[PDB]
Design a protein around this ligand. Structure first.
Ligand code: FMW
Length: 257
């Protein structure tokens, strides 16, 4: 019902999600201001998993200054038993919002796409490749999309649909082009209401369809135009032929209108 971080006291209202050892809570400080606290239990954690939480917290701190499209971290407490992270509170995650919302506005979709690109470009500049991008990694904070995690530490829950073909074939990798494919799948969902390989239920057959070059991804005609070109450029199976993020930021879809 109550917890202490550094010196400040916070009162728990409700739980948002869990990730094995991790937990996210909606809190309030002494001045009745809303915040989000991530609690990580380290009692069962090993030397490899401990260093992965140490690495993601360090990058979250450094990248605060570099972009406003990355979640805000205010303070943290790290001991041998736990981790407490005082972060900003979002309205909803992108996945929970996408499932509830039927039709999406084209001006809202265009705005969200630019936000995702800005956030993923920042981590790439610092040599980070997420490699597990999905809508749940993005948070809606006052009509703006912010990136929650960097994929260094372990994931959380409140799918193989966003996996690039090169990851499956690698059984010396990978490149920032892998995140471009995953981002493309999120945009394809915001455009057609389904992921490029959602139709296949059998996971063995679905994985074969992603790597198969003869398998043609469906691109139905829509009033937009530059949007259809982005989708075809992001969803290219060859990463060397796939579009880059600096190129995407200069594309007519992102710059014109
Ligand atoms: C006050 C409203 O709070 C939320 C309600 C919903 C939600 N609405 N319907 C369903 N859900 C889950 C979703 C998100 C938030 N805000 C939030 N803020 C800050 C957050 C920080 C972190 C590190 N992880 C969150 N979330 C984890 C998840 C993606 C795994 C959920 C965070 N979540």
């Amino acid at each position: 019902q109550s917890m202490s971080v550094k010196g400040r006291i916070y009162s728990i209202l409700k739980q948002i999600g869990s990730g094995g050892s991790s937990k996210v809570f909606q809190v309030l400080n002494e001045k009745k201001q809303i915040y989000a606290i991530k609690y990580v239990n380290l009692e069962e954690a090993d030397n490899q998993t401990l260093d992965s939480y140490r690495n993601e917290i360090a990058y979250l701190n450094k990248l605060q200054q570099h972009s406003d499209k990355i979640i805000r971290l205010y303070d943290y407490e790290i001991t041998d038993q736990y981790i407490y992270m005082v972060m900003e509170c979002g309205n909803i995650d992108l996945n929970s919002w996408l499932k509830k919302k039927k039709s999406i506005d084209p001006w809202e979709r265009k705005s969200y796409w630019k936000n995702m690109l800005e956030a993923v470009h920042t981590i790439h500049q610092h040599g980070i490749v997420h490699s597990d991008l999905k809508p749940a990694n993005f948070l809606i904070v006052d009509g703006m999309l912010k990136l929650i995690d960097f994929g260094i530490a372990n994931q959380m829950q409140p799918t193989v649909n966003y996996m690039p073909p090169e990851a499956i074939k690698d059984m010396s990798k990978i490149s920032p082009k892998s995140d471009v494919w995953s981002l493309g799948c999120i945009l394809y969902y915001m455009t057609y209401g389904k992921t490029p390989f959602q139709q296949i239920i059998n996971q063995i057959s679905k994985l074969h369809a992603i790597i198969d070059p003869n398998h043609e991804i469906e691109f139905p005609d829509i009033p937009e135009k530059d949007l259809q070109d982005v989708l075809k450029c992001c969803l290219k199976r060859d990463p060397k032929q796939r579009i880059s993020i600096p190129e995407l930021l200069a594309h007519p879809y992102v710059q014109i209108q």
